[PDB]
Amino acid sequence: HLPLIAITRNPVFPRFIKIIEVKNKKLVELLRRKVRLAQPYVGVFLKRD
Amino acid sequence: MQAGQRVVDNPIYLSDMGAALTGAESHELQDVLEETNIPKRLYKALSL
């Protein structure tokens, strides 16, 4: 139950470890707000052209 | 700086960095910097 993430030119193929490095620091706010939750998780989606 | 990390935010710099390893005399470097088109500089850097 989280708002969509900013893929920003980064393909994450199924069952293929990948790294994401956005230059903006606002997505880190969402990554630190999930630390108190019991299970922390995130979804990965794809962008259009 | 791997080609699989997709951290090459500036490809021109990666091609220049790869051409920097060449041992070609300075003149060759100046000539390659004069080159404006992309396949010529990549082709020449590979040639060096």
Q: Would an 8 Å CB–CB cutoff place A16 in contact with chain B?
A: no
Q: Taken in order B31, B34, B40, B41, is the CA torsion positive or negative? A: positive
CA distance B41 to B4: 23
Cα of A40 to nearest chain B Cα, Å: 25
Resolved by = cryo-EM
In chain A, the residue whose alpha carbon lies closest to the alpha carbon of B5 is A19
Q: CA-CA-CA-CA torsion for A24, A25, A29, A30, nearest 10 degrees?
A: 30
Chain B residues with CB inside 8 Å of A9's CB? 6
3-state secondary structure of B47: helix
